[PDB]
Design a protein around this ligand. Structure first.
Ligand code: HEM
Ligand code: 8QD
Length: 471
């Protein structure tokens, strides 16, 4: 009796469980590196640190490409900007220029710590008004980090109540929603198989994103001055200026649409990533009062109430620094990073990988590898401290919250500063507790282009100790 012709085979059910976890689980059958073919496209998935470091660092430039996706084309205005731009002159220029911009913010009025703290100060005054109430803290945090990224990009901020903030939240949620159903990694290309309105809806939100950023950049052409380079748009316009002095080869690279998309990548990631990690952290603290208590003891013992926290306090608030590390481990913002692509014929783990092959680093697998981590599925900030609680250790080499190599995160410094000061200022002022109905946040998460957490509410109360210290 005969066996059936097989025209197709997938290792696991699509749209069942988080992709990143399905790939991980599948290593128990197939090892830390395996591929899948979808028509002509081949994708390689890699779930061990050594192989990952090879893809990101040792052979970084071989695999520094980005695959093309119909969805990422719309958000990137056809692979302009930085994150979804393929390897090439454009990407290199803008990545470098965006990196150069952050370097500015080391000193003076536009020192990064002082910018963040001004916005955190507002946030906390605002949250304090909700004393005794249970709220979703998303929008307040969104506002705070949006003003920061706006300052970095434009040296402008939004006034309290500016309806533009709401317009931005709307299109951000709309784009993230339609950019991918779940993660960026789709085994089956569902959107090209059945009738649907995904690209239409995505274009609509991006169009509002673009029109908005266009007015800002239009208006700023009147304000640009070559003797005043203090933000990212300055930096970018200076480059276009210097290029056109017949025009340089960088001239094509810096059209207004190029500048716009890069600003968009930076504006989008400056809000969505950090707002998200803040929510995750609070979520984990609601689930672990014992950790949360010790963060209060720590921040009262090393900072007290004479003054507000400072970047300098990273020295003493070690458990807080450890807590942040652990969230970035347990719930990485990008658990499969952003997809990479083989720029040339190369190899991983001595296996052949052809030009154009998509390569995906399963960061989730690295952070949950049993042989590299003690009880990986547990929230344990202590793992990032020595047993004495006196300083910060790196307990595993299988840890890359911010990527590495040519495509590593360019916003890490900003991220780490925002994350640490937001959590420090909040913990100094507020008791952050479970709402009156007793609902805890689901820690499962919602994987999109970023690893989001479901909306949830936190009962916020002004601390006794903070109050008593106002005299
Ligand atoms: C909690 C905060 C953040 C985390 C954990 C994080 C982590 C990451 C990761 C894992 C990647 C992918 C690396 C790869 O594809 O190989 C990435 C890329 C990137 N990040 Fe972030 N990031 C964070 C915040 C930010 C912020 C605040 C910015 C602000 C500008 C930013 C800008 C970017 C950009 C532009 C890329 C694309 C790099 C490229 O394609 O060259 N990120 N980040
Ligand atoms: C999709 C978007 C959010 C909504 C809107 O603003 C449009 C933007 C367009 C750019 C996107 C952005 C989402 C985070 C991204 C993908 C990101 C990132 C991700 C995870 C960790 N570090 C950086 C680099 C580019 C960023």
């Amino acid at each position: 009796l005969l066996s059936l012709p097989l025209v197709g085979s997938l290792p696991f059910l699509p749209r069942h469980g988080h992709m990143h976890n399905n790939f991980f689980k599948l290593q128990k059958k197939y090892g830390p590196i395996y591929s899948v073919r979808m028509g002509t496209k081949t994708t390689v998935i890699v779930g061990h640190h050594q192989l990952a470091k090879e893809v990101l660092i040792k052979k970084g430039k071989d695999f520094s490409g980005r695959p093309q996706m119909a969805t990422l084309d719309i958000a990137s205005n056809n692979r302009k900007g930085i994150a979804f731009a393929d390897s090439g002159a454009h990407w290199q220029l803008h990545r470098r220029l965006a990196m150069a911009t952050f370097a500015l913010f080391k000193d003076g009025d536009q020192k990064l710590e002082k910018i963040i703290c001004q916005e955190i100060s507002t946030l906390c005054d605002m949250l304090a008004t909700h004393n005794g109430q249970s709220i979703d803290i998303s929008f307040p945090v969104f506002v705070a980090v949006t003003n920061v990224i706006s300052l970095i990009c434009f040296n402008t901020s939004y006034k309290n109540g500016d309806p533009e903030l709401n317009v931005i939240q709307n299109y951000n949620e709309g784009i993230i929603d339609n950019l991918s159903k779940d993660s960026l990694v789709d085994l089956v290309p569902w959107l090209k198989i059945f009738p649907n309105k995904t690209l239409e809806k995505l274009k609509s939100h991006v169009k509002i994103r673009n029109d908005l950023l266009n007015k800002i950049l239009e208006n700023y052409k009147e304000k640009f001055r070559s003797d005043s380079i203090t933000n990212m748009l300055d930096t970018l316009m200076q480059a276009k200026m210097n290029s056109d002095n017949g025009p340089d080869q960088d001239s094509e690279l810096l059209s207004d649409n190029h500048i716009l998309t890069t600003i968009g990548d930076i504006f989008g990631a400056g809000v969505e990533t950090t707002t998200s990690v803040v929510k995750w952290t609070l979520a984990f603290l609601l689930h672990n009062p014992q950790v949360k208590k010790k963060l209060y003891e720590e921040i009262d013992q090393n900072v007290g109430f004479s003054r507000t926290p400072t970047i300098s306090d990273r020295n003493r608030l070690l458990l807080l620094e450890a807590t942040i590390r652990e969230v970035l481990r347990l719930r990485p913002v990008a658990p499969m990073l952003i997809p990479h692509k083989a720029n040339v014929d190369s190899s991983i783990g001595e296996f052949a990988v052809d030009k154009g092959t998509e390569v995906i680093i399963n960061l989730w697998a690295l952070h949950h590898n049993e042989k590299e981590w003690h009880q990986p599925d547990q929230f344990m900030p202590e793992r990032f401290l020595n047993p004495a609680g006196t300083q910060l250790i790196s307990p595993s080499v299988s840890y890359l919250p911010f990527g590495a190599g040519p495509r590593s995160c360019i916003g890490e410094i900003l991220a780490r500063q925002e994350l640490f000061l937001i959590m420090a200022w909040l913990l100094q002022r507020f008791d952050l507790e479970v709402p009156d109905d007793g609902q805890l946040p689901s820690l499962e998460g919602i994987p999109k282009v970023v690893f989001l957490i479901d909306s949830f509410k936190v009962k916020i109360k002004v601390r006794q100790a903070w109050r008593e210290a106002q005299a």
